[PDB]
From a paper:
We used two previously unreported cases with the MAPT mutation encoding R406W, case 1 from a US family (temporal cortex, parietal cortex and hippocampus) and case 2 from a UK family (frontal cortex, temporal cortex, parietal cortex and hippocampus). We determined the cryo-EM structures of tau filaments from the temporal cortex, parietal cortex and hippocampus of case 1 and from the frontal, temporal and parietal cortices of case 2. PHFs were present in all samples but we did not observe SFs or TFs. The structures of PHFs were determined to resolutions of 3.0–4.2 Å and found to be identical to those of AD PHFs. The ordered core of the R406W tau protofilament extended from G273/G304 to E380. The r.m.s.d. between Cα atoms of the two structures was 0.78 Å. According to MS of the sarkosyl-insoluble fractions, we detected only mutant W406 peptides, except in the parietal cortex from case 2, where R406 and W406 peptides were found. Immunoblotting of sarkosyl-insoluble tau revealed strong bands of 60, 64 and 68 kDa, as well as a weaker band of 72 kDa, consistent with the presence of all six tau isoforms in a hyperphosphorylated state. There were also astrocytic tau inclusions in the cases with substitution R406W, suggesting that both nerve cell and glial cell inclusions contained the Alzheimer fold. In addition to filaments with the Alzheimer and CTE folds, we also observed TMEM106B filaments in the sarkosyl-insoluble fractions from brain regions of both individuals, who died aged 78 and 66, respectively.
Dominantly inherited mutations in MAPT, the microtubule-associated protein tau gene, give rise to cases of FTD and parkinsonism linked to chromosome 17. Here, we used cryo-electron microscopy to determine the structures of tau filaments from the brains of human MAPT mutants V337M and R406W. Both amino acid substitutions gave rise to tau filaments with the Alzheimer fold, which consisted of paired helical filaments in all V337M and R406W cases and of straight filaments in two V337M cases. V337 lies inside the ordered core of the Alzheimer fold, whereas R406 lies outside it.
Numbering used by the authors:
A (entry chain A), B (entry chain E), C (entry chain F), D (entry chain B), E (entry chain D), F (entry chain C): 304 to 380
C-alpha cells in the first residue's frame, strides 16, 4: 500500500506598481478627548488589545505591494 | 492499493497598476469625544480588541496591489 | 484499487488598472461624541471587537487591485 | 507500506514598485487628551496591550513592498 | 433768566448672592479644526476683532454680581 | 442770567457675595488645529485684534463682584 505525493506548485506571478509622481499630501488631525473607566481587566492566551487610544497615522508607501502565500502539506497515518 | 497525488498548480498572474500622478490629498479631521465605562473585562484565546479609540489614518500607497494565495494539501489514512 | 489524482490549474489572469491622474481629494470630518456603558465584558476563541470608536480613514491607493486565490486539496481514506 | 513525499515548490515571483518622485507630505496632528482608569490589570500567555496612548506615525517607505511565505510540512505516523 | 438744577439721586441698592457650596464642575472640550482665508484685511476707528479662534473658557465666580450705573448731566446754552 | 448746578449723587450700594465652599473644578480641553492665511493686514486708530488663536482660560474668582460707575458732567456756553 504505497503513497506517492508530489507538490510542485509553480508561481511566476508579479505584483507590480508604477507611479510617476506621488505627493502633496496633508494630514491635519484636529485633536480629541478620550476617557475609559474600568474596574478589572483580565487577559490570557494571545490577546491583542488597545484601550483609550488617540492615534494618527500617515502611511505613504511609494511601493505598497504585498503578497502572502502559505503552503501547508499535512500527512497523517 | 496505491495512491498517486500530483499537485502542479501554475500561476502566471499579474496584479498591476499604473498611475501617472497621485496626490493633492487632504485629511483634516475635526476632533471628537469618546467615553467608555466598564466594570469587568475578560478575554481569552486569540481576542483582538479596541476600546475607546479616536484614530485617524491616511494611507496613500502609490502601489496598493495585494495578492493572497493559500495552498493546503491534507492527507489522512 | 488505485487512486490517481492530478491537480494542474493554470492561471494567466491579470488584474490591472490604469489611471492618468488621481487626486484633489479632501476628507474633512466634523467631529463627534460617542459613549458606551458596560457592566461585564467577556470574550473567547478568536473574537475581534471594537467598542466606543470614533475613527476616520482616507485610503487613496493609486493601485488598489487585489486578488485572492485559495487551493484546497483534501484526501480521506 | 512505503511513503514517498516530494515538496518542490518553485517561486519566480516579483513584488515590485517604481515611483518617479515621492514627497511633499505633511503630518500636523493637533493634540489630544486621553484618560484611563483601572483598579486591577492582569495579563498572561502572550498578551500584547496598549493602554492610554496618544501616538502619531508618519511612514513614507519609498519601497513598501512586502512578501510573506510560509511552508509547513507536517508528518505523523 | 435763572437756571437752578439739582441732581440728588440716592441709591441704597444691594446686588447680593448667597450660595452654600459651588462646585463639581467639568469642562472637557473635544477639540476642533478652524481655517480662515483672506486676501486683504483693513480696520480703523475702534474695531475689535477675532479671526480664526478656537477657545475655551471656564468661569466659576463664587461671586458673579455686577452693577453698572451711569450718570450723565449735560448742559448747553 | 445766573446758572446754579448741584450734583450731589449719594451711593450706599453694596455688591456682595457669600459662598461657603467653591471648588472641585476641572478644565480639560482636548486640543485643536487653527490655520489663518492673509495677504495684507492693515490697522489704525485703536484697533484690538486676535488672529489665529487657540486659547484656554479658567477663571475661578471666589469674589467676582464688579461695579462700574461713570459720572460725566458737561457744560457748554
Amino acid at each position: 500500500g504505497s503513497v506517492q505525493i508530489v507538490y510542485k506548485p509553480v508561481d511566476l506571478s508579479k505584483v507590480t506598481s508604477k507611479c510617476g509622481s506621488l505627493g502633496n499630501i496633508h494630514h491635519k488631525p484636529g485633536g480629541g478627548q478620550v476617557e475609559v473607566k474600568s474596574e478589572k481587566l483580565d487577559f490570557k492566551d494571545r490577546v491583542q488589545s488597545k484601550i483609550g487610544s488617540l492615534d494618527n497615522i500617515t502611511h505613504v508607501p511609494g511601493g505598497g505591494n504585498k503578497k502572502i502565500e502559505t503552503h501547508k502539506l499535512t500527512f497523517r497515518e
